[PDB]
């Protein structure tokens, strides 16, 4: 019944916090100012489980071993070591003093498959291991009222019911209910996705648990303020606690380049399968037995499945892997590397994946002129104008009338990414004073201040009086900041290039429309003032007041706005705008409030100029929105209020005709929705996320990508990817890197199935026309898991032919990565052309040793036989078993290495699908070293002392090297000339059947 | 999931009617210009070989010793009376010998009586074609003694006692050349040593040797080897009907109802022998005359 | 006699090819 668990999980939470303070302490049985008594802790404590989420499902160490050892690939390769044993099961039974091949064979397959997954195993135990090494989090203790007493203990050590009192800076232990706060401004960013820094109130406010501020949530710093509140839900049962308990419980599903190894096994099984049964009809109607017949059909399904092609595979995977973690783009799903690559629709969050949650100054007012300050969170943007005498005004207001700075260890840190203790907006006006105008250190002391005033609830200004700086002696300075509307209207001066002025509606107005498009735009304005006490009417020393306001609160010289907003990671836009390029369709999936989620979409990219939603046509034309039709709107915003209501056909529409979508204040349960809708219709989608409410998103989705060190542990877990150095850039190397590796598999796999057909064409027709064996096993062994393993993976570092991040995503239905085309190259004409050459080496040692090619017609029945010493050649001489023996294995090693010849040009012609070799050239070095090293390793395999009593694999006489020279060229050229039809005639029969 | 069968834009086995000509069409010329090209290899290759010599002959460096029974496992296990047990063995041994009866060798024009004693290398000028078809030496059945083919006694060989005839591998252009001075395995056996390539059987440990009690060989004149005036081989296609020399071996004494391993050792100097190559100068038997 | 192939000889070349075409192909791939 776990699928009706997994449902329960999905729906939205319900909670008690519309209760009557009476109400509430009713219901668990708490003191509101004394908590509860330490023995009944121990009645909790030791009842439902200590304050800590149950720790994730652990799979020991054997079970990734096995988990490689079997696998798809490798379940292909088990079959065939499994029918290398029958065989040699039914080959026992039968002959007379049988052979080891079969036996070799199979256990050299199964050797393969334990290589393999031990190499996997290490390579995916490495992501892991540094994955640990990155997650050290430690213990965070609550202080809690208890028996009327104050005492810190353990975070897990906290019960369901007791008084809980949280600091400015201390974190929300367990789900709260608020019953007297101080101006406390939890950060709900990693949970419910709210940018701006939400205040909690004990009164309850919106019905929505979430919404609501009498509630403090689990993994949510306090960042100002204090607070009192009654745990409510404890451990597993917090809110959070549920959404990583759901995460925990979903299906991954299956990777979009799973599929593509699986199609691929089934075409190499439907080749494997067809030869056999095809060859067993013609091995029975010609002249064998069902004894016979079986062992063929065994031996040509085995033959017919790539041996090597494992670990080419999985290293070629590995490599762009490595590529990745260089650039701390890490994977811990080996296969998890290709899946951008197919990607064509990226769902993302904005409060912390695309923004860098971090309220910071966007924009100041300053002699009617707005200033753009640099939002980039590395200080890589352009700098604002600062000559003017207004500056300095406004960046004094700032700096001093400001209640903290920095903390203790905040000094070798970067400005920006240091901590700071106050309100964000504090936080955010100092950091700007701190690039822009120096210091605020001794700026602020310089300036010593008296009376300060801080915000109230009646009357609502923030001010402070402080003395004046250096010899211009008008003695003090009084500075207040606050609502723009509110310090408007305090105020009667307007500082203007340097100079006062007055308050004339003219400029006043010219302030409004300014206040307006600072918060059009997505931003919170800040008004900030100040005034010079005449020091002729008012003493130069003592001379302040507090209960019955002296200082002039109004007439007061107004300087400028100050606006800010979390604003977009550095690279963000241009990621946006490169992944639109490529046609992946960009979806923002955030749960803080649309008026913030459009602007942000806007200024990313997700939201284009020109392109209007239902709302902005209905503003143009003064008009209802009932009234416009929603097919005249491109793009929209979809309000989570709204997603609740909605039914599965309705998401649907909503996906299909809008390009630009943003779905704005959406449950974490919500956002699986979005994405389960999203793959309704076929299309591949990853999901990136920082936040716990991210979790049941980036598990689901294909692929998930979390932020290294801005997503929370809990999403980084249930993630594919992890951005190290949260760089959002990374996606768009992720996709190139994807598709890349996609092409140059389909050109590693091509290159090693043309070679099954010289390799098994020779036992083929050993069967066929009764001649003597052309090729051995030990060769084979030698070719597929010898020589053409460097080949075939140093074709994996080939690079683009075309601008990759140009062409439309992938299409699974499709566009498949082993299709009939790559079958009919390799199988059909190039690897036809590799059989014929070996032929020809094979012909021509023979018949120069005296056995001419006519000669060996049906000889191999006296020519396997090791009592028949007299057979005769064409010449009349007669050779013994082991002489003619050794002439097939002087004959076998020069068909391996025929096949090497053959495989140089083969090589160089799957080097490229489309663009010439010298278009693309021949850069990649590690295929240059591939042909250097696969020819003295063929070399060597011949001329080195003892491989004729080893390997039984004879040096050869050197004009033998030659015998397969034109064939290799005969190859190239070929393919040359059909790559440039292909280039010149881009129209049918060359690109429907050739191109792979 | 196998529907491929047929699809309403006329669909066969996966594709259309033109698209099957087409590509059927592409393969045919492909294919046959491929098998074009390898037979136009495989005839410059056949042009670069020459018909009276093969281009290489050290793979047959130490030339091999059959004998008539080509047994299953060189054994040879029979009964005395049976004739039956033996047909396998006399068989191969008549059809063996049916090319040198004398009536096989009777035209002159192709045939030269050598001689009935041994007598030195025979070279027949050089291997090219500028002389006509070379002469081949007569070798009659009756030089082997006692195991001679149909002239008096049929005897096939058996009604107790078996022949084992031993022959050297045939060898274009080889020279043999019998030992000289250093002599630490030449038995006595015969006197003569310069114009005749001696071969001797033994047994082949304490067991054996002792087991197989007397062996009395057959050859040119009386000689247990082969005749130097039947060498060099000049090729099949320059000696048609060429008859290597024969060496009859009789196993008297032996033990019946016992399986007893004989090895027949070829000497000389351009004979060669090998640990993996039993039959590369040397031969072997396992006899057995089970009663 | 033509029965004899200097088979140490073609051997050893096919050693030293060996050899000296992987040192190449170490250089090429370790280049600098
Ligand atoms: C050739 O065949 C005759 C049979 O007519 C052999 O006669 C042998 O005579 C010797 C001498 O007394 C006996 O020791 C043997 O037992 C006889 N053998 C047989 C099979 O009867 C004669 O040895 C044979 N060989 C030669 C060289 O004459
Ligand atoms: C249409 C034209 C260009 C094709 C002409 C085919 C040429 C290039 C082919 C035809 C026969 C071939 C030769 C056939 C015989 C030999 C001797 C052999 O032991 C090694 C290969 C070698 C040395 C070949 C080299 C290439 C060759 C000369
Ligand atoms: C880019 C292409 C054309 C380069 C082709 C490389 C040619 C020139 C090289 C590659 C491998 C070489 C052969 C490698 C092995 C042997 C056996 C050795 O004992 C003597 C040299 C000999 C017979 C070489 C002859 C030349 C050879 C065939
Ligand atoms: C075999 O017969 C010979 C005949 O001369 C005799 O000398 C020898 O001792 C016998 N050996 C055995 C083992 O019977
Ligand atoms: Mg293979
Ligand atoms: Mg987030
Ligand atoms: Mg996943």
Redesign the interface.
Known sequence: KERDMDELKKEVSMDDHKLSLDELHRKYGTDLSRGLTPARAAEILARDGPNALTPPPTTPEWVKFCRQLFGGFSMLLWIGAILCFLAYGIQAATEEEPQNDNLYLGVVLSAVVIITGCFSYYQEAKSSKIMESFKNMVPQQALVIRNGEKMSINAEEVVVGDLVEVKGGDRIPADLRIISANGCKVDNSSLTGESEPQTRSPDFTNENPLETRNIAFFSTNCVEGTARGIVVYTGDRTVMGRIATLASGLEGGQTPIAAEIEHFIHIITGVAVFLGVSFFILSLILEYTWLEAVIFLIGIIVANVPEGLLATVTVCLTLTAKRMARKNCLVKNLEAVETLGSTSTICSDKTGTLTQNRMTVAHMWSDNQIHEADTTENQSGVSFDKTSATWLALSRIAGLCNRAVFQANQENLPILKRAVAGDASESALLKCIELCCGSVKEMRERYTKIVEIPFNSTNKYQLSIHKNPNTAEPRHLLVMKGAPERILDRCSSILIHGKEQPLDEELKDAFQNAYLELGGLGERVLGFCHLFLPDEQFPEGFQFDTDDVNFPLDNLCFVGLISMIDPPRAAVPDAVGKCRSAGIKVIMVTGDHPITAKAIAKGVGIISEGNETVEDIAARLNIPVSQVNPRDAKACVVHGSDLKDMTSEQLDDILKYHTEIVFARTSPQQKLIIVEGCQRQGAIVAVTGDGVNDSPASKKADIGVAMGIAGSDVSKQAADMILLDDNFASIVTGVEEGRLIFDNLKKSIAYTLTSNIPEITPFLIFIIANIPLPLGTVTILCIDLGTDMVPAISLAYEQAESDIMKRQPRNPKTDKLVNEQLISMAYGQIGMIQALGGFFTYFVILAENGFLPIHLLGLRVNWDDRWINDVEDSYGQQWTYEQRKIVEFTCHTPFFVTIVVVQWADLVICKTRRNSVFQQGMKNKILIFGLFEETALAAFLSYCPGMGVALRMYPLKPTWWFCAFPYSLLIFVYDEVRKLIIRRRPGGWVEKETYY | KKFIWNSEKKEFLGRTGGSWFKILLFYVIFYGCLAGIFIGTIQVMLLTISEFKPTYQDRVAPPGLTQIPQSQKTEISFRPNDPQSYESYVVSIVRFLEKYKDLAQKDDMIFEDCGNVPSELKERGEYNNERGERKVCRFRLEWLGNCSGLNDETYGYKDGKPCVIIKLNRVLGFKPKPPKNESLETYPVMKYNPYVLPVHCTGKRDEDKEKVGTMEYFGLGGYPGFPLQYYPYYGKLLQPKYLQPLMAVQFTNLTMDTEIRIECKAYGENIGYSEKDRFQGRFDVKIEVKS | ?????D?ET??????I???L??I???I??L?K
């Open positions: 006699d033509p029965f004899y192939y088979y073609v051997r050893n070349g096919g050693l090819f060996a050899a075409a992987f190449v192909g170490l090429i791939i280049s």
